[PDB]
Amino acid sequence: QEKRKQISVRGLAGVENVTELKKNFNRHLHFTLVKDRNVATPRDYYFALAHTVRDHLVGRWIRTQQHYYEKDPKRIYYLSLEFYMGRTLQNTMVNLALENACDEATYQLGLDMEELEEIEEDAGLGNGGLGRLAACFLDSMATLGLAAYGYGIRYEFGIFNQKICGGWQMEEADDWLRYGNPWEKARPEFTLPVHFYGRVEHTSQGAKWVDTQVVLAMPYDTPVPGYRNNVVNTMRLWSAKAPNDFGGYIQAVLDRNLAENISRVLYPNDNFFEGKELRLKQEYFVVAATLQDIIRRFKSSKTNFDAFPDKVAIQLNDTHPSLAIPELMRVLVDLERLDWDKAWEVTVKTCAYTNHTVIPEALERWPVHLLETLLPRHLQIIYEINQRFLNRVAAAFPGDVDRLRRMSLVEEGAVKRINMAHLCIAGSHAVNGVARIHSEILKKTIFKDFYELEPHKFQNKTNGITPRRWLVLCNPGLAEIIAERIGEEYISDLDQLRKLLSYVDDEAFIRDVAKVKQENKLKFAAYLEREYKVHINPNSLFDVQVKRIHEYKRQLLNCLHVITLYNRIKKEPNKFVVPRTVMIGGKAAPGYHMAKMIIKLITAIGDVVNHDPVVGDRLRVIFLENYRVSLAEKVIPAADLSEQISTAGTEASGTGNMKFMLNGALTIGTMDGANVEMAEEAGEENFFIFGMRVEDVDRLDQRGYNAQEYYDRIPELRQIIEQLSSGFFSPKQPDLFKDIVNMLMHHDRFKVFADYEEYVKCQERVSALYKNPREWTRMVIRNIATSGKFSSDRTIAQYAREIWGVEPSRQRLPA
Amino acid sequence: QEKRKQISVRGLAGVENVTELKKNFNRHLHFTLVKDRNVATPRDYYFALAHTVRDHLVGRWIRTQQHYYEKDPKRIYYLSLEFYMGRTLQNTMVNLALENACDEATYQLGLDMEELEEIEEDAGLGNGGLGRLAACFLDSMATLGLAAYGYGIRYEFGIFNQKICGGWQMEEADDWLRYGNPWEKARPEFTLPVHFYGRVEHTSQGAKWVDTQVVLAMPYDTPVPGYRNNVVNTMRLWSAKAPNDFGGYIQAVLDRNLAENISRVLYPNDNFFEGKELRLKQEYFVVAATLQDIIRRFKSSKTNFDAFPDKVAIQLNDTHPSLAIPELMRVLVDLERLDWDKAWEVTVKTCAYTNHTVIPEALERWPVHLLETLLPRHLQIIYEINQRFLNRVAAAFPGDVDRLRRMSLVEEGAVKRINMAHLCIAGSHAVNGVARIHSEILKKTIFKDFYELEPHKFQNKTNGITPRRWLVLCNPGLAEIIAERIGEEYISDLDQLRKLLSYVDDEAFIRDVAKVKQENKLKFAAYLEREYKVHINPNSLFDVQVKRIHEYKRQLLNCLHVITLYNRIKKEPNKFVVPRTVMIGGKAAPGYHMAKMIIKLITAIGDVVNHDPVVGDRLRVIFLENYRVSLAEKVIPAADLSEQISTAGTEASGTGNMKFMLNGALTIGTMDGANVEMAEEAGEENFFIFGMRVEDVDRLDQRGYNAQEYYDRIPELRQIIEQLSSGFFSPKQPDLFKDIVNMLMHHDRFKVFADYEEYVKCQERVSALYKNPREWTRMVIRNIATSGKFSSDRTIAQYAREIWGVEPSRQRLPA
Question: What reaction gets catalysed by this protein (chains A, B)?
Answer without folding.
Answer: [(1->4)-alpha-D-glucosyl](n) + phosphate = [(1->4)-alpha-D-glucosyl](n-1) + alpha-D-glucose 1-phosphate
